[PDB]
Each structure stands twice: as structure tokens, then as C-alpha cells.
Design a protein around this nucleic acid. Sequence first.
DNA 1: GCCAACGTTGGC
DNA 2: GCCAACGTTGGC
Length: 68
Amino acid sequence: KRMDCPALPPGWKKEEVIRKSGLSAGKSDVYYFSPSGKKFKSKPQLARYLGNTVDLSSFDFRTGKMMP
DNA sequence: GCCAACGTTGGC
DNA sequence: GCCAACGTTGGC
């Protein structure tokens, strides 16, 4: 399920997906979805898209919070 | 050719 | 030793 991420612009959602198989089974990946539904796999990728819209320097990609 | 899913490693 | 970040690839 895609959760709302209030630290990002309206419409932004975070999803955490448990790996199901392989040696990394049990681990999890985090994704964000833009208001238009585009998928983001890393903080630099978000940064390049959001630019000056928000400062992501204090942003924890995994938890989706601003942690200073 | 695409991309979801897992593998992989450099930087800490 | 962990994990953020991105590379690889099997299945479609």
C-alpha cells in the first residue's frame, strides 16, 4: 500500500516492498510515487526531479521524514 | 525493449 | 557489518 508522505508536495506517496525470494529475501525497498505516478528509487533521483521545490538534505529516504 | 525484482558494492 | 544507491537480468 502507498502511504501519504506529508514531508513532500501533495500527492506524493511512499511504498515499502519486502523482498520475497533470494539471498536478500526479507529485506525491503522504499519507493516514492509522484502525483503523476512516476516511480522513484533513490534520494538523488527525487532531488533531480524536485530541485528547488524542497530541500531534501535532511530527508530520510527510508522513513520519509525530515530528520535533523 | 521494458522493468520489477534481486544482486551487488562503495562509502560509512 | 550495514545499507543507500544503482547495476543486472528473467520474464514478459
